[PDB]
A paper describes a structure:
Here, we study fold transition between distinct β-barrels by protein engineering and structural biology technique. Here, we discover that the previously reconstructed ancient DPBB sequence could also adopt a β-barrel fold named Double-Zeta β-barrel (DZBB), as a metamorphic protein. The DZBB fold is not found in any modern protein, although its structure shares similarities with RIFT and OB. Furthermore, the reconstructed OB fold could also be converted to the four-stranded SH3 fold by a simple circular permutation. Thus, these ancient β-barrel folds (DPBB, RIFT, OB, and SH3) could be readily interconverted by a few feasible mutations through the missing-link fold, DZBB, indicating their significantly close evolutionary relationships.
To examine what determines the DZBB–OB transition, additional intermediates have been engineered by sequential mutagenesis and experimental validation steps (design-12–17).
Numbering used by the authors:
A (entry chain F): 5 to 55
B (entry chain A): 6 to 55
The structure:
Amino acid sequence: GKKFVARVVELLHDPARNAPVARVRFEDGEERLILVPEGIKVGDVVEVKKV
Amino acid sequence: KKFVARVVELLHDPARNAPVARVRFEDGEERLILVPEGIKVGDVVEVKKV
């Protein structure tokens, strides 16, 4: 359907994992923390999608 | 590459439009993320940049 997207607003570091966690912002103004891939920058948009 | 995880649980909170899914990543780590409507338990989701 419509692409499920969120804007990356902050990039944090998870020390347990050596991996980035982005603070993201949904269309309704909700903000959550997600594991993201490498190469994500603040200001990008990420999609969650079935494979 | 392809950053993926398998939906283990899925819950519709009447408080938001999108459902909350508990996903299992590569190493076994589990977290709660918002998924699109129509994700069912057992699906694999991908987090990618657009």
